[PDB]
Amino acid sequence: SLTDAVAHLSPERWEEANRLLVRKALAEFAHERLFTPEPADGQDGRYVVRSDDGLTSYRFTAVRRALDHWQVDAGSITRTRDGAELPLAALDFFIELRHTLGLSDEILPVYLEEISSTLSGTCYKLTKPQVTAAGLLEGGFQALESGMTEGHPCFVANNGRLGFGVDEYLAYAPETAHPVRLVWLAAHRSRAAFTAGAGIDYASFVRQELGEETVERFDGVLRGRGLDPADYLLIPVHPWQWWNKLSVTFAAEVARQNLVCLGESDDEYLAQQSIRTFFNATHPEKHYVKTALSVLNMGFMRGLSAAYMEATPAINDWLDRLIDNDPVLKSTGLSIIRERAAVGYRHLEYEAATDRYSPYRKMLAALWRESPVPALRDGESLTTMAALVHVDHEGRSVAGELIARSGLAPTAWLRHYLRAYYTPLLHSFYAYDLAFMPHGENTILVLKDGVVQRAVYKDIAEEIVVMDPDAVLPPEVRRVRAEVPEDMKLLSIFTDVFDCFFRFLAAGLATEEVLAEDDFWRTVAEVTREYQEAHPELDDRFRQYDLFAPEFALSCLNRLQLRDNAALQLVGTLRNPLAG
Amino acid sequence: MSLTDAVAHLSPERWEEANRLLVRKALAEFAHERLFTPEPADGQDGRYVVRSDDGLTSYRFTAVRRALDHWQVDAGSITRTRDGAELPLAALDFFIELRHTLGLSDEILPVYLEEISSTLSGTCYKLTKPQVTAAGLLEGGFQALESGMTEGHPCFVANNGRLGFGVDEYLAYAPETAHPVRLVWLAAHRSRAAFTAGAGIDYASFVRQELGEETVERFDGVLRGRGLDPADYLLIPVHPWQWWNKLSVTFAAEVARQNLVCLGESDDEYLAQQSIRTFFNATHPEKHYVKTALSVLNMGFMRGLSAAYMEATPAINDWLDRLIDNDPVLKSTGLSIIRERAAVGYRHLEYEAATDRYSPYRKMLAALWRESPVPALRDGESLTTMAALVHVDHEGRSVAGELIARSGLAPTAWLRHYLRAYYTPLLHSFYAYDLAFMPHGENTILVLKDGVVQRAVYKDIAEEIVVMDPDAVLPPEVRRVRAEVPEDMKLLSIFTDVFDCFFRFLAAGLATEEVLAEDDFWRTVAEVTREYQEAHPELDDRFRQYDLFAPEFALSCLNRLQLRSAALQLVGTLRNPLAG
Alpha-carbon torsion B559, B560, B561, B565, what sign?
Answer: negative
Could you tell me where the beta strands, DSSP code E, fall in A208-336?
A: 232-237, 259-264, 269-271, 277-280, 288-291, 296-297, 300-301, 335-336
Q: Do residue A245 and residue A292 come from a single domain? A: yes
CA dist list (Å): A484 to A152, A424, A466, A487, A488: 25, 20, 9, 9, 7
Are A444 and A456 within 8 A, CB to CB? yes
End-to-end CA distance of chain B: 59
Sheet holding B260-265, edge to edge: B233-238, B184-189, B260-265
Are A70 and A30 within 8 A, CB to CB? yes
Among residues A331, A348, A378, which one ends one of the domains?
A378
Are B440 and B374 within 8 A, CB to CB? no
**What does the alpha-carbon distance between residue A515 and residue A513 come to, in Å, rounded to a whole number?**
6
Are A311 and A479 within 8 A, CB to CB? yes
Of B76, B75, B69, give the one whose Cα is nearest residue B38. B69
Q: Do residue A503 and residue A554 come from a single domain? A: yes
Q: Do residue A244 and residue A350 come from a single domain? A: yes
Q: Which amino acid is at B71?
A: W
Q: Which residues 6+ apart lie within 8 Å of B91 measured at CB?
A: B18, B19, B22, B23, B26, B116, B120
End-to-end CA distance of chain A: 60
Q: Do residue A313 and residue A410 come from a single domain? A: no
Are B304 and B295 within 8 A, CB to CB? yes
Q: How many residues does chain A have?
A: 580
Task: Please give the tally of structural domains in chain A.
Answer: 4
Alpha-carbon torsion B510, B337, B420, B573, what sign?
Answer: negative
Q: Is B356 helix (H, G, I), strand (E, B) or coil?
A: coil
Domain of B160?
132-179
Q: Please tell me the distance in Å from A279's CA to the nearest CA on chain B.
A: 23
Residues of chain B neighbouring A98 (CB-CB closer than 8 A): 354
**What does the alpha-carbon distance between residue A34 and residue B431 come to, in Å, rounded to a whole number?**
62
CA dist list (Å): B129 to A57, B150, B178, B269, B280: 63, 11, 11, 22, 21
Q: Do residue B229 and residue B324 come from a single domain? A: yes
Are A185 and A237 within 8 A, CB to CB? yes
Among residues B358, B379, B400, which one ends one of the domains?
B379
Residues of chain B neighbouring A248 (CB-CB closer than 8 A): 117-118, 121, 163, 165-167, 170
Could you tell me where the beta strands, DSSP code E, fall in A56-182?
A: 57-65, 69-72, 78-81, 84-86
Give residues after which chain A gaps, C-N over 2.5 angstroms: 565
Q: Which residues 6+ apart lie within 8 Å of A39 measured at CB?
A: A45, A46, A47
**What does the alpha-carbon distance between residue B295 and residue B293 come to, in Å, rounded to a whole number?**
7
As beta bridge partners, residue B49 has B39, B60
Q: Which residues 6+ apart lie within 8 Å of A433 measured at CB?
A: A466, A467, A468, A471, A489
Q: Do residue B424 and residue B567 come from a single domain? A: yes
**What does the alpha-carbon distance between residue B256 and residue B233 come to, in Å, rounded to a whole number?**
15
**What does the alpha-carbon distance between residue B202 and residue A553 come to, in Å, rounded to a whole number?**
66
Q: Which amino acid is at B161?
A: G
Q: Does A118 touch chain B if contact means CB atoms closer than 8 Å?
A: no
Q: Please tell me the distance in Å from A8's CA to the nearest CA on chain B.
A: 8
Q: Please tell me the distance in Å from B310's CA to the nearest CA on chain A.
A: 22
Q: Do residue B295 and residue B270 come from a single domain? A: yes
Are A273 and A442 within 8 A, CB to CB? no
Residues of chain A neighbouring B106 (CB-CB closer than 8 A): 355
Among residues B179, B211, B237, which one ends one of the domains?
B179
Q: Please tell me the distance in Å from B149's CA to the nearest CA on chain A.
A: 21
Q: Do residue A193 and residue A342 come from a single domain? A: yes
Q: Do residue B391 and residue B280 come from a single domain? A: no
Q: Do residue A201 and residue A223 come from a single domain? A: yes
Residues of chain B neighbouring A263 (CB-CB closer than 8 A): 3-4
Q: Please tell me the distance in Å from A219's CA to the nearest CA on chain B.
A: 16
Identify which of A109, A117, A263 has the shortest CB distance to residue B351: A109
Are A13 and A126 within 8 A, CB to CB? yes
As beta bridge partners, residue B48 has B40, B61
Identify which of A242, A243, A349 has the shortest CB distance to residue B113: A349
Q: What are phi and psi of B57, to 5 degrees?
A: -125, 140
**What does the alpha-carbon distance between residue A550 and residue B117 come to, in Å, rounded to a whole number?**
59
**What does the alpha-carbon distance between residue A200 and residue A194 come to, in Å, rounded to a whole number?**
11
Q: Provide the H-helix boundaries in B326-434.
A: 328-332, 349-354, 399-407, 411-433
Do residue B110 and residue A350 have CB atoms under 8 angstroms apart? yes
What is the DSSP-derived secondary structure letter of residue B130? P
**What does the alpha-carbon distance between residue B481 and residue B467 come to, in Å, rounded to a whole number?**
6
Do residue A349 and residue B92 have CB atoms under 8 angstroms apart? yes
Q: Please tell me the distance in Å from A502's CA to the nearest CA on chain B.
A: 34
Identify which of B166, B257, B351 has the shortest CB distance to residue A11: B257
Q: Give the resolution value in Å.
A: 2.8
Cβ contacts below 8 Å, chain A against chain B, sum to 143
**What does the alpha-carbon distance between residue A451 and residue A391 come to, in Å, rounded to a whole number?**
18
Q: What are phi and psi of B271, to 5 degrees?
A: -125, 125
Q: Which residues 6+ apart lie within 8 Å of A269 measured at CB?
A: A179, A180, A181, A182, A278, A279, A280, A281, A289
Q: Does A412 touch chain B if contact means CB atoms closer than 8 Å?
A: no
Percent helix, percent strand, percent coil in chain B, to nearest 5: 45, 20, 35
Q: Provide the H-helix boundaries in B281-392.
A: 313-325, 328-332, 349-354
Cα angle, residue A35 at apex, residues A32 and A38 outer, rounded to 5°: 120
* Helix (H), strand (E) at residue A40: strand A38-40
Q: Do residue A561 and residue A484 come from a single domain? A: yes
Q: Is A438 helix (H, G, I), strand (E, B) or coil?
A: coil
Are B78 and B88 within 8 A, CB to CB? no
Q: Does A220 touch chain B if contact means CB atoms closer than 8 Å?
A: no
Q: Does B171 touch chain A if contact means CB atoms closer than 8 Å?
A: no
Q: What are phi and psi of A244, to 5 degrees?
A: -100, -35
With CA atoms as reference, the chain A residue closest to B98 would be A353
Q: Do residue A169 and residue A216 come from a single domain? A: no
Do residue A165 and residue B248 have CB atoms under 8 angstroms apart? yes
